[PDB]
């Protein structure tokens, strides 16, 4: 509070989200274009494809589960 010096610089917050809601990871198309834009970087590169595969896996966990032969034995 400007009126009180003690209040100033104390218990003062300035939240600024809103736009922060937007997530780039939610736009793979944009990310792909970014990598392609970079020099020496191509979508046909194995490294680029591998990175997307790993990132995609981490982003979403597979829910697939065996329905039989659970016990390898």
């Amino acid at each position: 509070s400007a009126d009180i010096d003690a209040s100033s610089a104390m218990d003062t917050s300035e939240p600024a989200k809103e736009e922060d809601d937007y997530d780039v990871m939610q736009d793979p198309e944009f990310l792909q274009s970014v990598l392609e834009n970079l020099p020496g970087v191509d979508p046909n590169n194995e490294a680029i494809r591998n990175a997307m595969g790993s990132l995609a896996s981490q982003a979403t966990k597979d829910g697939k589960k065996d329905k039989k032969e659970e016990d390898k034995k």
Partner: protein, 64 residues
């Protein structure tokens, strides 16, 4: 313009890794020329740049 900002950050990180500060001595692990950093390919650097973006790693050069 948030999308553009994201690209700029990645581009800066990529160039920083492929360029660095130019100084032999660097206190930034994720910066070219840094003894702790090793030269990377165009594809390898791209991956590192992407990863750096996620962690929002700080750049060697000071912010505007």
């Amino acid at each position: 313009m948030k999308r553009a900002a994201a690209k700029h950050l990645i581009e800066r990180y990529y160039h920083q890794l492929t360029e660095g500060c130019g100084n032999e001595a660097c206190t930034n692990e994720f910066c070219a020329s840094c003894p702790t950093f090793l030269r990377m390919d165009n594809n390898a650097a791209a991956i590192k740049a992407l990863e750096l973006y996620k962690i929002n790693a700080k750049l060697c050069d000071p912010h505007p």
